[PDB]
């Protein structure tokens, strides 16, 4: 909710996921 | 509320699923 | 509201997924 | 709703699915 | 969206499902 | 190497190798 | 090598593959 | 080198794999 | 060795893997 | 060389490989 | 300006039972 | 203008019993 | 005008059961 | 503006079930 | 702004027995 | 009686390679 | 006494490889 | 007695590459 | 008599590479 | 009576590689 004077920002929103099973 | 200074902004929303499974 | 710069812009949304197989 | 001057775009909506199978 | 002059588009979400047949 | 009054012995050697695949 | 009287012994090998296919 | 006297006695070796995945 | 008085034996070796993923 | 009196025994291997997956 | 490209479900359902006999 | 491109769908179901006698 | 982009999903649901029996 | 973000989502379940009996 | 922002989330469960009887 | 029975033997090699051209 | 059962043997190998570009 | 009863074996190996670039 | 019994192998490797680039 | 006890042994390795850049 940015409502303040202008300035620059960014918006990216990145998921991953990542496993190794031995068994 | 997105407003700020005018700029270049992307929602770009990447996913991805890895697994290693050995089986 | 998105309201700025008059520029171009595209939603690269893609997904993948990879598995392995052993037996 | 993004405005701006009248310009090209295309949605590049992209999927893939692919696994492995030994039977 | 775009909501200006008449201009050439067109959606191409491209999709692609194969499997590694072995039997 | 058995050797002895006849009997009824046999060999009963089965084999099962079951493998899922979603494609 | 179980050798002795005629008896009426046999064997009852038998195979069995399994697999499951979606395509 | 198994010799004695006679007995009931059958080999009865058995093999099973299973395995799942998500995709 | 076996080289005694007849006494009830008989092998049973089988192997279970088992493994499982949640992706 | 286990030489004694007929008791009771057989033997049997068994093995289990059982895993934890995080993800 | 509504426009939506297809799509198609891709359902799959496999099942069986194997039950053989001595006799 | 309302807009919103569809998704692929696969509902995976696999599930058997077997049971062996000997007789 | 309403905007809402997808996600993929899957159920997945694998289960068997298995009574050997040498009689 | 409306707009919903939904997130990634998918269910898992894998369990078996064995009860061996020799006879 | 009329704009959700779910937080990710994912059912898990993981569970298995196994019995063995020489009988 | 130096003799052994048959058997057979699965061995099996694919192998494929896909790759897109836009030009 | 030279004498030794047969045995089931599975051996595979497979590899793919899948590229993109946009030129 | 020269007796050695084989042994299940199932070689594999499995190896996949994948790559995307823009231009 | 020389006999030997032998025990379960397998040899595992699985190994992946990727290497994601937007230009 | 030449008997030796054979040793267990099971072969793993899991190993990945991943070079995330946005340029």
Aim: charge should be negative; glycine fraction near 0%; aromatic fraction near 0%.
């Amino acid at each position: 909710e940015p409502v303040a004077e202008p300035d620059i920002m960014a918006t990216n929103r990145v998921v991953h996921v990542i496993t190794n099973v031995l068994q």
